[PDB]
Amino acid sequence: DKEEDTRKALEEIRFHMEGDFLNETETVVSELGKKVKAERYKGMTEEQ
Amino acid sequence: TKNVTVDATGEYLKDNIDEYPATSSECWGMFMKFTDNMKGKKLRECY
Amino acid sequence: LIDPFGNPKVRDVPDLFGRSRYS
Amino acid sequence: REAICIHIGQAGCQVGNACWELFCLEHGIQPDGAMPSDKTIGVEDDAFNTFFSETGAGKHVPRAVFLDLEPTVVDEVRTGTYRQLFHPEQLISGKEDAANNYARGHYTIGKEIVDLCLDRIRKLADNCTGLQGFLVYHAVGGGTGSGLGALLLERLSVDYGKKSKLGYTVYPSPQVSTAVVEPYNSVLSTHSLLEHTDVAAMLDNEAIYDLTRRNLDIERPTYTNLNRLIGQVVSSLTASLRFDGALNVDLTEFQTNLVPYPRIHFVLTSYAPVISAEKAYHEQLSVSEISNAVFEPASMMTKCDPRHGKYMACCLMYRGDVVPKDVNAAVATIKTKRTIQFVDWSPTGFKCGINYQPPTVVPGGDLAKVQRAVCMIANSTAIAEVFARIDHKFDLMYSKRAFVHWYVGEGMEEGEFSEAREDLAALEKDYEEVGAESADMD
Amino acid sequence: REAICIHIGQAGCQVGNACWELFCLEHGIQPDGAMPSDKTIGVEDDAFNTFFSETGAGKHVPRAVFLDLEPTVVDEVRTGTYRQLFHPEQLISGKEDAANNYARGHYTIGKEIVDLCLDRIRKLADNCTGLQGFLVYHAVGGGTGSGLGALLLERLSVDYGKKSKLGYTVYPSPQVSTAVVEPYNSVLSTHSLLEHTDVAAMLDNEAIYDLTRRNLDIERPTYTNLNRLIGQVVSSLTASLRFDGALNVDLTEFQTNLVPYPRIHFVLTSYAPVISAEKAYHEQLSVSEISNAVFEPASMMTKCDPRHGKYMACCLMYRGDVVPKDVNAAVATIKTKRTIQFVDWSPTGFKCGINYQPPTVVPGGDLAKVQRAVCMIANSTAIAEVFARIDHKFDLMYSKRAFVHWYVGEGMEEGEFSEAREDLAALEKDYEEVGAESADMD
Amino acid sequence: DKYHVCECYGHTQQLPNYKKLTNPRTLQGFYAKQKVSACPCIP
Amino acid sequence: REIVCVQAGQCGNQIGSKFWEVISDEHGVDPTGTYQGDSDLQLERINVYFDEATGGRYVPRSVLIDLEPGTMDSVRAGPYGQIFRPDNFIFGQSGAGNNWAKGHYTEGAELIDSVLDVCCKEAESCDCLQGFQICHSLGGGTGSGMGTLLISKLREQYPDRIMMTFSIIPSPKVSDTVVEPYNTTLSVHQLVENSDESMCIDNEALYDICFRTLKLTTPTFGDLNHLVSAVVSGVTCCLRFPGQLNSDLRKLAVNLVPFPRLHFFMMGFAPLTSRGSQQYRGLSVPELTQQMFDAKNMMQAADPRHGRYLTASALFRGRMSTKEVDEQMLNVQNKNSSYFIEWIPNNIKSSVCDIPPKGLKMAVTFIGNNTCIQEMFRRVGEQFTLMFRRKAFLHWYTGEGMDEMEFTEAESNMNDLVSEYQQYQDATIE
Amino acid sequence: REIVCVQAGQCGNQIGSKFWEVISDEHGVDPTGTYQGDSDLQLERINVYFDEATGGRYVPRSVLIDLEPGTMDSVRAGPYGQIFRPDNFIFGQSGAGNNWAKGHYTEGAELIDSVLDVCCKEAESCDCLQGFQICHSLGGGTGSGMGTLLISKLREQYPDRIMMTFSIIPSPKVSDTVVEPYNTTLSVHQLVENSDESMCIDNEALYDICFRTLKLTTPTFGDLNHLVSAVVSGVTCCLRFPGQLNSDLRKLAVNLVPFPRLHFFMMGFAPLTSRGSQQYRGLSVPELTQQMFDAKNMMQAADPRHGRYLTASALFRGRMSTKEVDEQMLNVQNKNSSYFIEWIPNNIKSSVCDIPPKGLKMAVTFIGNNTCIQEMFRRVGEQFTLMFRRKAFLHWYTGEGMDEMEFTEAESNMNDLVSEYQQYQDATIE
């Protein structure tokens, strides 16, 4: 049981570290969302 | 006088970039940058 | 470089004299 | 972290050219403000921020203003090699000089130019987040440096208040002289330095000429050499903010350690391994040798002999390959000497600093390359002798109302001469009283 | 969504040329009214609709009228490059001018032309589905601009009622002047502007000349520079209707937030990144820097100093790459300053707007290209000094009836001068009273 | 004390009274209440 | 046991989009509406928030109302916007103008009947209806006026159910609009009569959460709405999953409100920690409890240390022992006894639920009833008194038709709410 | 039985970095924080200084405080720096200015609440709390003022626990700071009331140790701080490993302190010997005892030969006989009997621990309570009276806000401490 709890906690940390909320990125984008960026605007890209 | 004194060594520096000395200033890190980025964002204090 | 107890140690002061920032 | 530099008149702008040349070469900014970012060995670091701000396209621009009443010297800066480094608004120039009249600078002409300068300084101070003082460069012998220096300092005190202002000032040398009216301008600058300045360092060109003749091997020095020495001193003192070290020292620690009473803020400066390239490879330059060097009067950058007074505090900045144990052994040997005396109310006379960055070598420069250096600023009662000779020369001329017509016609009451001379006399008496031993105890 | 522009006389038509060049270039409409047939961006967006309507043939045509009493300027528009953009009915021209007489415009000549203007406005308002106000451009110094502008605003105010009317007005400069009779026309104008406008923005050419000399590097400016600046301001205020953003602001929110009492509707306007291309590479231009810029009196487009009064409300429009947190940090920095003062009855002094579309760059233009800009409109008690110089000049001139026979011959009772002068005096006293502290509770 | 209080030389360090300086100048409010004649004309 | 959601104004519609993303993710519903989940536990309570339309699809029980269609274009552009039923979007053609009276009296009465018709259509379809959930801001125009109008109408039609609101209130430090105090005062008057339980959030507290705890370099309103959507989806979790000690909105209300006006609550959510720090701390019940009571983690500007707790509730999600929960609540009650109102012998309710939020091993949400909430209302009343003494902007409201006596009545009601909290703070046994 | 550490100022952070390197090395913790040790004996007492983070890792129970983050960035940048929890670094925005009054009154009161919150959070997590451990210098600015402020707050909140300090004091020959007498006097005034046990080290004594005993050619602060970290880690060894005669900080205090003001101690560590000489002499209990009592090996400038020992303690590490300890301590007391206070029949406590520091067969740490400490205080008081009589730098402190009465109180209290030591020096049986 101890080993199982350890594995679940490691999966927890791996989920938080790779998530999009803390990394400030977005992956689920709608086609209309590529033009309208009402909330989710954060800044300009390098190419711009 | 300013030409022959300062502009000559300025031109020499323009020609040669190996005269700039190396250094180490590890005291400038992430907490200093955090304090730099947080100017004017004071919130939730009691007086 | 020797510790006060006799063991070897790594450098602790940077080597800067005679060095250049840009290759 | 950041510091703002204010350059006034001819000496201050010319010393500024050497200072900013040095600070560029020390940080690694090219003369056009760029940086060869792709050719690098180490990693890019924030240390420039004390003196530079970035636009974001990676150009660097410096935190300075240049103030003059004649255009020619600033136009020389505008047309030189560093043309692209400075923002054009920072280089401020008037129409006509203060003609060696303090009154002309202070009342009539500087009042027109002063509001642009204050607006630029405000624009700099708004782009800061931990400003810890102003550095001011001026000469008190000329008209615009004295008068506009005084007015700007007075306005800054009301606007910024408690924020510190540290001045490096070229005072009139005790027998080399350049203009007749130097005593009036130097006297009438007494109030500004006495009441609106936190530490003032005094320099005389005759001492730097003596140092460059004796130690360096230069037969025919010119102002660029003196300005390069001043730039080296300033770089040594500000290195403690910018680079790693064993014992760091923030600019507020100088003020805490050097000034015992609020008027006693005038300090002497000296620098140790002033040496030529041919001599430098014949000699070792150990810590104890340069520590012994800084106390000899042949090393000083002000024409005063400290043997005629008593030390109150010393602040010693070591940079380069030095080990603290050698600094302690050197300071204990200095303390042993019989010709060095401290006032009995100051038992713990020393402050130390130790920094790892060795002094930089400038391609056209005249100093040798050396692994270590030490720089000292110290407060001593011997300075009272410097004021007395100016007061004697002032007393000579004012007695016959020799040139008073210029100042009274251009707007000054005759009373102001007597006022300034009595205030500096009281400052001399303060320096006499503070230095008197408390031998009467019971 | 929609707004209708009314341009009157010489200044209003010339400013209209700059406005419509800019609005065309910003949307991408060619000067002939046809969008590029090969430019398939992918999604034909509706943003033009605020300023253009389509002719069903797919041409775009703009929601504007050009009004003049002399033919020359409108015939110049008719023969220029944009001939095909405008509908020919929109360009209305009379035979002869109002000869610098407000009385001639109001009573004699504008009464003939006004019904054509009303028919065009009727035809425009019928081709709308969410009209939300009129923008009016005129000068009060000339005869037709004052007289016909007042008469037309009166007729609009009876016919349309509650619909908003926002004026951009060229006021007489405090010492630069172009005609002798300016005080009479400005006094007679102000009663109508008081009664028949919801917000009035005041402009002086002398301020825009100072701004173009100081900020831009133009030695010999002409009206096209000023008109391009005005067009930029109008585009900034109307951008909130036309492009995506974080915090939109409809013109009724502007009116609700900016006007505290129904008579207190005269506002100051300023614009931040007026900068040349060569200056643009020496400085970053962050949100906080341009926010600090809009509050300096050197940035204003009207010759008044706001430090001599108190702010009641400010509306700040940001366009371009800005994040709300930076706007909040900037506004929090502004609030600390002691030389910026708000009336104690207005604690929450600010309104914000944030739009993502950066300002457009015009090929022949003199402004640099910049990633962000801010525009401010603010209501302040400082305006009372502005009224006082016209009242003093009117009193000086009217004491001898210097020109009154022209006005009496063209149809006006002499009594009307005194009535208008007393009404403007009461408005001056209102601005004195509103700024008086509430010491009633003591 | 033994020095001067800086009211000499014609300088003062007292902070300005912002509320008083901030009120505008008007013909009846300011100019008409002066012993010596005053006018808003620019010299 | 079905909840109906109402989203009003820009803030409400934006928070709603993130809320429905979180709920659709937890039940494995694709943004097309198709079920793609992998356990029966997801399906067996899907009815609580979704209705099932024919051939697979699920539709979310929400009404969207706004005065300008700008928001509809913003929600339609989001990643989940397609899921919403077209007939559920109600919009006008001109804005509220940031004016409470306009939003309440002129366009409010024009639209409100169609909103009530949609809400009734949604309510009468449920086999048994649980409370309503409403998101809106109090500082706005249509949010305050039309939200409180609709709340009053729903309170007329369903007085025995629960009425729940989440509400954003103007910061004392940062504002986007000048006339916030009037709209806030009138809205607080409406809420204290109509609501059963009200949660209050300061945007300043969400910015301070983001900057200090999460160290985000460039936070956006999406982050604030994610924090809010997290707590909103957490409060209902025990309604819709199994657990060792079930709980319900009505049991929370019964345990939190001693007297019917004292229905204003504090919010918190415990597992917040920066990506750099996450490697440094393992999950455990003491860590969650410690973060849960830290005022740093509370979403209002008022701090609990300036008040006293009447009651509190904690809802735990995850597989954990009941002993640790009970003993933690005992230890916190015993060590800080001066901060708890003494004429109630035990102030904390606990509840335990088996199913955590996705990607977290454990979570707790905290609801607190503390008298220091009176400080927020006092600040709003101060700014109101500064503007009102001088009639600073009243002609807009009076031109809509309001009597000036209305402003003094609303001010008096807020002052009485502050007085009642202060009196219960300083009560004693004698 | 777990300790919470506080490190303050530049000296404190630098000494702390070496201490946590030494502690992590003895327990086999990688600089990433991962346990890589090779015996269960390492794990079974890891709790004393480390908390356990998930899947292996351990984190050190320490608070880092400074007024400018430059030092914090230097410590974070060090080779073991990663182990420290990011949230545990507390810093302000402006310096102490090397001024005690600034550190105590202006920036102290600004930061202290966040430090007290972190220290309480760390303390209340412990199942049973042992004393606090604090490292700082008295001559500095933020170290002296904020360290003594924090000590006073922790003494208010935890008066039944132990308060322990390690402190650096100005050398008699060369000053590092001009205003050292004021900062030292005020700090000693605070410590003598607040502290339970205080250890003193002179940098001059470490230089003399290095040069005379170790013959090091080019010593650096890393060597001095390594010697200090060695003794610091030695004092706690019996807390955290088995032995024939266990010992504890409280047992040390009870045996060392006869009266509550007499709590200032000298330190030494015995098996110091140069790499060239080490081949010539094996370790044994007589060799350690002889070096241990040699004044050459003592870390203060005062010499025992000018005073008398009230009490002493020796902690032995290694596999060793009880005969050598008992008979050596008796033999040393008998042969040098004039240097031991005669009205206590046995002045030395011994303790024995099985596990030596790595690479030494045996070690002892010595703690001594000796009246020669009065000479240091007398020297500091003389230099203070010379400076104070002339108002030498007083305007800085008075401008911060201090009343002059503080200086006369602190001087009088320190002078009474010197008198009390002198009185116990010359006491007799009669």
Ligand SMILES: Nc1nc2c(ncn2[C@@H]2O[C@H](COP(=O)(O)OP(=O)(O)OP(=O)(O)O)[C@@H](O)[C@H]2O)c(=O)[nH]1
């Ligand atoms: N060390 C050094 N001294 C200088 C330099 N330039 C001028 N001085 C000295 O400063 C004094 C002259 O002051 P100036 O700077 O020329 O006076 P100013 O500020 O130009 O005032 P005006 O003449 O009224 O314009 C003399 O004693 C010069 O020797 C310089 O570049 N370096």
Ligand SMILES: Nc1nc2c(ncn2[C@@H]2O[C@H](COP(=O)(O)OP(=O)(O)OP(=O)(O)O)[C@@H](O)[C@H]2O)c(=O)[nH]1
């Ligand atoms: N900024 C700006 N000011 C202008 C422009 N044209 C005229 N003015 C100013 O406006 C005032 C003159 O008003 P006008 O427009 O010439 O008067 P009008 O409308 O032609 O009236 P009439 O003379 O009767 O035809 C003067 O102060 C001019 O400086 C312009 O194009 N731009």
Ligand SMILES: Nc1nc2c(ncn2[C@@H]2O[C@H](COP(=O)(O)OP(=O)(O)O)[C@@H](O)[C@H]2O)c(=O)[nH]1
């Ligand atoms: N936390 C949060 N605040 C918001 C959001 N949108 C707007 N606001 C705030 O709410 C206030 C504006 O009110 P708004 O919703 O536009 O009122 P409405 O026009 O009646 O809908 C301002 O303080 C905004 O900062 C959001 O998505 N999240």
Ligand SMILES: Nc1nc2c(ncn2[C@@H]2O[C@H](COP(=O)(O)OP(=O)(O)O)[C@@H](O)[C@H]2O)c(=O)[nH]1
């Ligand atoms: N042993 C030791 N002493 C130090 C170290 N760093 C500074 N010191 C001493 O501590 C004193 C300076 O105090 P400091 O830490 O700078 O005070 P602060 O400015 O308040 O942080 C001087 O006596 C220094 O010699 C160190 O790493 N080791």
Ligand SMILES: [Mg+2]
């Ligand atoms: Mg000159």
Ligand SMILES: [Mg+2]
């Ligand atoms: Mg005309």
Ligand SMILES: [Zn+2]
């Ligand atoms: Zn002065």
Ligand SMILES: [Zn+2]
């Ligand atoms: Zn006049």
